[PDB]
Amino acid sequence: LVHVASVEKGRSYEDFQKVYNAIALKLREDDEYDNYIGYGPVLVRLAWHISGTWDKHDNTGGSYGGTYRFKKEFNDPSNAGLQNGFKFLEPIHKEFPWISSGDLFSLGGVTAVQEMQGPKIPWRCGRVDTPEDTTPDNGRLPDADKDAGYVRTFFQRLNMNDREVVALMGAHALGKTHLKNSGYEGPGGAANNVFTNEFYLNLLNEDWKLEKNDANNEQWDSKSGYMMLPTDYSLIQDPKYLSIVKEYANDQDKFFKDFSKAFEKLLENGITFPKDAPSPFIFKTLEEQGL
Numbered sequence: 197l198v199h200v201a202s203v204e205k206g207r208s209y210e211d212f213q214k215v216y217n218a219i220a221l222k223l224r225e226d227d228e229y230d231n232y233i234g235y236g237p238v239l240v241r242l243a244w245h246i247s248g249t250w251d252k253h254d255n256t257g258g259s260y261g262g263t264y265r266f267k268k269e270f271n272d273p274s275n276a277g278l279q280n281g282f283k284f285l286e287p288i289h290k291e292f293p294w295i296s297s298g299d300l301f302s303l304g305g306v307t308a309v310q311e312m313q314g315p316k317i318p319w320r321c322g323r324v325d326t327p328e329d330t331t332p333d334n335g336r337l338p339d340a341d342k343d344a345g346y347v348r349t350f351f352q353r354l355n356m357n358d359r360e361v362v363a364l365m366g367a368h369a370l371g372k373t374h375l376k377n378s379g380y381e382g383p384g385g386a387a388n389n390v391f392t393n394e395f396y397l398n399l400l401n402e403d404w405k406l407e408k409n410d411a412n413n414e415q416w417d418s419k420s421g422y423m424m425l426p427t428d429y430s431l432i433q434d435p436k437y438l439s440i441v442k443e444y445a446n447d448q449d450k451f452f453k454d455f456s457k458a459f460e461k462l463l464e465n466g467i468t469f470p471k472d473a474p475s476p477f478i479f480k481t482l483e484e485q486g487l
């Protein structure tokens with residue numbers, strides 16, 4: 197099963213920087229969402245969920261086909277809450293109807309990371325919408341109540357190794373769990389709409405207690421009001437993951453560079469780029485443009 201990137205007809209870097217900027221300006225404007233967290237975190241989770249359905253064995257799933265727009269995937273229990281991200285991006289799609297759905301959802305996550313002061317994430321265009329019957333079945337996104345061996349095995353299906361898994365999980369410094377969406381409640385730190393390495397610092401430095409929440413699920417909670425999923429906490433229970441947690445807690449730049457590479461890879465899994473494809477784009481932030 198081969199998915200070849202096909203650039204939206206006649207488009208180039210400037211076109212996609214315009215779409216970036218529209219997303220970024222709306223991120224700035226719609227600041228009230230989720231008790232003033234803003235839409236940045238949910239856009240990052242949307243880009244990950246539309247990509248995290250990929251299966252390396254048969255190239256099903258993945259960001260290419262934009263299939264989150266179809267009911268079966270939109271209504272996956274694992275995707276509860278991401279409707280808010282889709283609705284955010286709808287007026288953007290209306291203004292730029294030429295962009296593919298996969299390109300929009302993945303660009304929304306790149307834009308959110310960068311606007312939240314995260315690393316630059318190179319991004320490539322050319323995902324092509326595919327029909328409803330190419331939508332992957334529910335059940336391909338991971339469970340949160342599991343341990344390190346589950347996490348490790350899960351991510352082999354996405355061709356991610358230990359370092360890439362630990363780097364990607366640093367996105368859990370962003371946003372929060374919502375009890376009605378996932379049966380978990382609370383944020384993982386204090387700066388949860390700024391992209392930093394706080395997730396690793398908090399795993400190492402907080403005093404975590406294993407508690408039950410109001411949905412009767414266990415999670416790790418700290419007296420500062422932070423929380424970790426069981427799969428988050430597994431990163432300090434496993435000695436291989438713990439080493440990498442310590443590395444990223446002690447080196448902000450290294451985390452940013454490893455995250456950028458793993459996140460681009462996540463967003464590009466499944467896609468074949470022609471040798472003649474444009475090189476990846478690195479968008480300027482609004483701040484860098486004086487906008």
Ligand code: HEM
Nearest residue numbers: 237238240241244277339340364367371372373374377378
């Ligand atoms: C073992 C792997 C993972 C599990 C089990 C997991 C699970 C969760 C759960 C249960 C939530 C809460 C959803 C809610 O209640 O609204 C969450 C939120 C989130 N996840 Fe993950 N996740 C994983 C990996 C990742 C990855 C790889 C990324 C991106 C790189 C990511 C980004 C996020 C973001 C940014 C949020 C906050 C969303 C919000 O505030 O609306 N997750 N995740």
